[PDB]
Design a protein around this ligand. Structure first.
Ligand code: HPA
Ligand code: HPA
Lengths: 338, 338
DNA sequence: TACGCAACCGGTTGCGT
DNA sequence: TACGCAACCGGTTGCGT
């Protein structure tokens, strides 16, 4: 069809091309005509054709886990913003922590020849670890590890441990010593990592956590509900609870409110993430905030660099968590004796 | 590089091709060799090359509004599931109710030659209306109108009005007559349409809504907060409130809980959407459920048809809302006198 | 000066033998 | 029998004049 343009315009296609991409001088008269031709013709230049030659699709691929979850959703929205802002196009792909689906997506992505890859697969078993290496060639950044797990990629690191520690302390310095914890999957960073940041704080203060007091979540509200309830269901119950993430948290508030417990009056809750609506949680949630947006843009940019500046050596940027004080935590028994 | 394969395998590329796409018989010996060549070679066949010839990218484009919002997010997750399941690849693009960004996305999409388009732009002014026609050629379904607004597209319709009516009735039949309403943007379907479904129910019951009692929302929690609060801030206040959507609702619960009002004891709230976590709202939200998942898959399929079965005539499928009874509504003053 | 020739990017496919 | 020739899909670009 570029041919149809050149022809209506009575010029070559090389010409037609150059005008469309402002790539070498062209007479006005000339320029005009092509524009008109492109116009009456209702012309849209194919990018697949163009891509075939130039050797880049100008589109990036997000090999995500799931996309509804507030946490995820929020990052993604970020990343898209950035792609759009720099001409990139986004391919959102969710493997749902499934290898098979992951190999698949990875393969379609390669075939569609994505300029780069953004990886958020939550859990990284050896198998997934290996597959990814099989594509070192396509440039990529893993956005969700605690520390760099491989040399063939870029990594953006969150400091989940120092976030976990932050959560513990606050609890501590506010009067508590009988604390519970609902962590997320241990097979994750935001799971294991947040937990241990928290646990160090406890060891530091000679506070021990009764195992009947730590209940595994999966980052979903329901798991929050079930844990909160299994915790407050006990003879002896804590005065404060540290919840792995905001959504599961919001599920801990429900349960407590269902056994007519009071937050923060009967139980204080500290969450983790600082999702867009935690302030409108009830009560408004106190939690550790993860810079999700800088998490996103910071990832793009590392990619873009590898893409453009053709970098070869892996990089790793750290991002920082921070405390957001709301109204779901209350002083505890030991406040004044400090 | 297909050439490099053919060569290592000592056969033609036509051959190499046919084996890779099981498109005509090939000797085993032959088949094997190519597989081996593809292998040692670590071969990934380009789809852009392939697309160039076959004339289809095998990828669809979502011209969305925003993607963090639970409602949206949930649909999207749906749609992706379906694309993946039928080989399609997804391009998520959010125009944020901005024409300029919309023209842009639309254009990149055309250029990248998407097999079809899924449209969710919330508001459709004449301008946006026109641009879309400029692409009748690319096959598309609008997933968010109340009734079909143009002949050059497919439409999936939700029945927002009969959802709005449902919400009113329940309120009514539960004892209420002093009701308020926080609608979403009137420039939308889920805004205007839900409102009027609701208002008919009221007219039907000689119930009038004091204008100081209807407060505009924007589907965001904060707008929920501000409205709830502007409503209960009055001398004379309603006994029940109908909220345009679940997230704004969850923001209405916060405020009420902040002026120490009681839900549903001091105010009953009926929401709209049935988002994944409304059950874990506090109290667990009573609301009208929109089949979001069937909303998604039902859209794909209309597209896929137009794509595959090359249909030309616009279609329109209707989907149905339904009541989900939770614990945020309580009997009202007139219950027994009915 | 301002522009055109023609080869190539990596696959697919209609005819052949 | 099982397979190869070569033209084409729609652009881009190094040399020319
Ligand atoms: O691994 C995770 N999954 C879901 N939500 C999360 N929020 C923090 N970490 C996670
Ligand atoms: O237009 C809308 N926008 C956001 N959320 C929504 N939920 C229902 N309708 C809408």
């Amino acid at each position: 069809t570029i041919k149809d343009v050149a022809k209506r315009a009575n010029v070559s296609t090389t010409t037609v091309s150059h005008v469309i991409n402002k790539t070498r001088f062209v007479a006005e008269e000339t320029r005009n005509a092509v524009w008109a031709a492109i116009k009456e013709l209702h012309y849209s230049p194919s990018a697949v054709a163009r891509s075939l030659k130039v050797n880049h699709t100008k589109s990036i691929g997000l090999l995500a886990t799931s996309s509804e979850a507030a946490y995820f959703a929020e990052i993604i929205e970020a990343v898209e913003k950035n792609c759009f802002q720099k001409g990139y196009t986004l391919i959102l792909g969710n493997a749902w922590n499934n290898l098979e689906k992951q190999r698949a997506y990875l393969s379609m992505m390669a075939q569609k020849r994505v300029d780069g890859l953004l990886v958020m697969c939550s859990e990284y078993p050896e198998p997934l670890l290996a597959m990814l290496e099989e594509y070192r060639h396509i440039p990529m950044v893993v956005m969700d590890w605690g520390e760099a797990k491989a040399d063939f990629t870029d990594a953006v690191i969150d400091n989940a441990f120092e976030g976990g520690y932050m959560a513990g302390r606050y609890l501590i310095e506010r009067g508590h010593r009988e604390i519970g914890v609902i962590p997320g999957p241990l097979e994750r960073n935001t799971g294991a990592g947040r937990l241990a940041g928290f646990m160090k704080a406890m060891e530091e203060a000679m506070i021990k956590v009764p195992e009947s007091w730590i209940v595994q979540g999966d980052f979903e509200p329901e798991s929050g509900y079930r844990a909160m309830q299994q915790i407050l269901s006990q003879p002896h119950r804590p005065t404060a609870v540290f919840c792995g993430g905001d959504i599961m948290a919001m599920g801990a508030l429900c349960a407590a409110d269902e056994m007519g417990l009071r937050v923060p009056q009967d139980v204080s809750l500290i969450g983790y993430d600082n999702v867009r609506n935690a302030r409108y949680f009830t009560p408004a949630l106190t939690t550790i905030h993860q810079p999700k947006d800088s998490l996103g843009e910071t990832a793009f940019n590392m990619l873009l660099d590898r893409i453009v500046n053709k970098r070869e050596e892996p990089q790793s940027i750290e991002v920082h968590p921070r405390l957001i004080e709301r109204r779901s935590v209350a002083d505890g028994p030991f406040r004044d004796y400090r």
